[PDB]
């Protein structure tokens, strides 16, 4: 489900509301990391930093949620 | 034709996404009793895939043990085969460890004791599981302290006594034994290697062999190149490290057996040997371990749908 995927991304982001490209590269195989980096939109919500990626927007859109 | 499942059971939500089968919860309507239905669509299966389905059904019927999922019924309809199991409701072991927050060596020892008893039973019935991995370790219920149940005999094979043979490449890379990776004849010890990998993860929350390059992974496994690094392993009892060492022995003939491991002091004298210290870093790591596993499956599926 989208809930499980978002929660898993959040875990790899150390519970931040966004994830960074370097965290995807550390935690995921390279092609999986790049697939996500290419398709995650910029996070602009609370606590955003430059390079913040919106894993929640990506995951919700993927499953039509 | 037979429509006994269709007539007597109702199907509900999916419980497990398999490669060529699905597990859904079902209810036997007359009794009101819930079960799990493992469903294979047999319409376009090869002769070899039929044989493997029939092998799994046979093995599931053969195995009766408190720490093995129990087959309730088996139903063949025109285009589908149903293996109906007693429903276990506690979910995956590794998810429960994270959810319940606190975990010690004593907890891991009680867990792996149950797994070893299940594996011993399989081996005593002439069955090698070949797929011991976290997804196949379930909990009987959400009851605190619920029994561990070994699940999913899709890869299991029948052996004859102690005879070793090349039964093929099958299993999940991080859990494969050196003898399989060397394409050597193999048998029961492959399950004990996988048990050692699982036990290592139960203690520190990350796997002993890992590498993005699967070829490098397999060289590391074949070399037995794992480590007990500081600081997390500094608090692990010598007896726990000893049991891991004896399971992760690259020579299968010298590797500890299930019966022998059940007699190992960290298992058989858990109350006085296993540490009761909560291992926070283990649970922390396990949380990331489970997340990587989920995302691997989700992202690989998304990538596959992109290639089209």
Features:
heterodimer; A: 65 residues; mainly alpha; 4 helices; 55% helix; 0% strand; globular; B: 308 residues; alpha+beta; 2 domains; five-stranded antiparallel beta sheet; two-stranded antiparallel ribbon; 9 strands; 42% helix; calmodulin binding (chain B); EC 2.7.11.17 (chain B)
Helix content of chain B: 40-55%
Helices and strands of chain B, in order, run as: HEEEHEEHHEEEEHHHHHHHH
Number of strands of chain A: 0
Strand line-up across the major sheet of chain B: 1-2-3-5-4
How much strand content do the residues of chain B show? 15-25%
Number of domains of chain B: 2
Distance between the termini of chain B: 37 Å
The computed structural class of chain A is: mainly alpha
Distance between the termini of chain A: 10 Å
What is the H-and-E element order of chain A?
HHHH
The chain-level structural class of chain B is alpha+beta
Report the principal-axis shape of chain A: globular
Helical fraction of chain A: 55-70%
Biggest chain-to-chain interface with counts: A-B, 16 and 15 residues
Largest sheet of chain B: 5 strands, antiparallel
What is the count of DSSP helices of chain A, taking H or I runs of 4+ residues?
4
EC number (chain B): 2.7.11.17
Modified residues (Phosphoserine) (chain B): 253
GO molecular function (chain B): ATP binding; calcium/calmodulin-dependent protein kinase activity; calmodulin binding; glutamate receptor binding; metal ion binding; protein serine kinase activity; protein serine/threonine kinase activity
Subcellular location (chain B): Synapse; Postsynaptic density; Cell projection, Dendritic spine; Cell projection, Dendrite
């Amino acid at each position: 489900t989208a809930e499980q995927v978002i929660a898993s991304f959040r875990i790899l982001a150390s519970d931040k509301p966004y994830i960074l490209a370097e965290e995807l590269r550390r935690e995921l195989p390279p092609d999986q990391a790049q697939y996500c980096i290419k398709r995650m939109p910029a996070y602009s919500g609370p606590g955003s930093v430059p390079g913040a990626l919106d894993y929640a927007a990506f995951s919700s859109a993927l499953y039509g949620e | 034709t037979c429509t006994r499942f269709t007539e007597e059971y109702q199907l509900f939500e999916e419980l497990g996404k398999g490669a060529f089968s699905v597990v859904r919860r079902c209810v036997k309507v007359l009794a009101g009793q819930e079960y799990a239905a493992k469903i294979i669509n047999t319409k376009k299966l090869s002769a070899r895939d039929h044989q493997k389905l029939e092998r799994e059904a046979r093995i599931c019927r053969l195995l009766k043990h408190p720490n093995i999922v129990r087959l309730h019924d088996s139903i063949s309809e025109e285009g589908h085969h149903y293996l109906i199991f007693d429903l276990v409701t506690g979910g995956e072991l590794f998810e429960d460890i994270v959810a319940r927050e606190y975990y010690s060596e004593a907890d891991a020892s009680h867990c792996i004791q149950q797994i070893l008893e299940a594996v011993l039973h399989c081996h005593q019935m002439g069955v090698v599981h070949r797929d011991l991995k976290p997804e196949n370790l379930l909990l009987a219920s959400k009851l605190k302290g619920a029994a561990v149940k070994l699940a999913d005999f899709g890869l299991a094979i029948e052996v004859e006594g102690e005879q070793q043979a090349w039964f093929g490449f099958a299993g999940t890379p991080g859990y494969l034994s050196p003898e399989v990776l060397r394409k050597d004849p193999y048998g029961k010890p492959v399950d004990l290697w996988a048990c050692g990998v699982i036990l290592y993860i139960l203690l520190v929350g990350y796997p002993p062999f890992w590498d993005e390059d699967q070829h490098r992974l397999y060289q590391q496994i074949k070399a037995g190149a794992y480590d007990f690094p500081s600081p997390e392993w500094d608090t692990v009892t010598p007896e726990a490290k000893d049991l891991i060492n004896k399971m992760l022995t690259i020579n299968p003939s010298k590797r500890i057996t299930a019966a022998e491991a059940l007699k190992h002091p960290w298992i058989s004298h858990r109350s006085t040997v296993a540490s009761c210290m909560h291992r926070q870093e283990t649970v922390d790591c396990l949380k990331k371990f489970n997340a990587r596993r989920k995302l691997k499956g989700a992202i690989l599926a998304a990538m596959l749908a992109t290639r089209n």
